[PDB]
Amino acid sequence: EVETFAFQAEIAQLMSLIINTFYSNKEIFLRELISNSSDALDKIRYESLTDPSKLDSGKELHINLIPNKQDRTLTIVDTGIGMTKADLINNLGTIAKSGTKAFMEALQAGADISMIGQFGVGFYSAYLVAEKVTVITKHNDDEQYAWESSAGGSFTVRTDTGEPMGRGTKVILHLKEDQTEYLEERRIKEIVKKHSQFIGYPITLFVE
Secondary structure (H helix, E strand, O other), rough: EEEEEEEEEHHHHHHHHHHHHHOOOOHHHHHHHHHHHHHHHHHHHHHHHHHHHEEEEEOOEEEEEEOOOOOOOEEEEEEEOOOOHHHHHHHOOOOOHHHHHHHHHHHOOOOHHHHHHHHHHHHHHHHHHHEEEEEEEEEEOOOOOEEEEEEOOOEEEEEEEOOOOEEEEEEEEEEEEOHHHHHHHHHHHHHHHHHHHOOOOEEEEEEO
């Protein structure tokens, strides 16, 4: 069972801006997704402070970066709080309508696309480098779901009968053909060191 949804107009506009604007500094997508993962990790840590059973679905709080040159994917995995079905549908747990408005106003006043994360919509920077994004997620007390979109105004949601995750989120970037530098170990290492060097969770770059 696959459900197809339309993006809200403002989010479709955000995505079209990201996909169509000439902007060479694409590498910031990784900083933004790592930051989102850190935020998700913070959320489950906070819940666990008063209810340790929240970590029964996995105690380790970390981020994995997994390139796969055969599939042309870069996957960012975290063991954060995850998302419910309703969160997925609600713009991946964001306030993307108001955030998009604030980002657009900032762009008009001299900001650039690299500032996207200040507006709570950094996830969508994935579309700087990905033709399709698949998000697999598992929140405590909800089932595992897969969200997917190739932009074009719609996304899908289905229950994921794939490999179980204990808890967290996997963002699978199906890279554009000219963006395969982001599968190279030395390039990923460089970007992590430049933009994510103080993130307070382990970031493991897998090799192939």
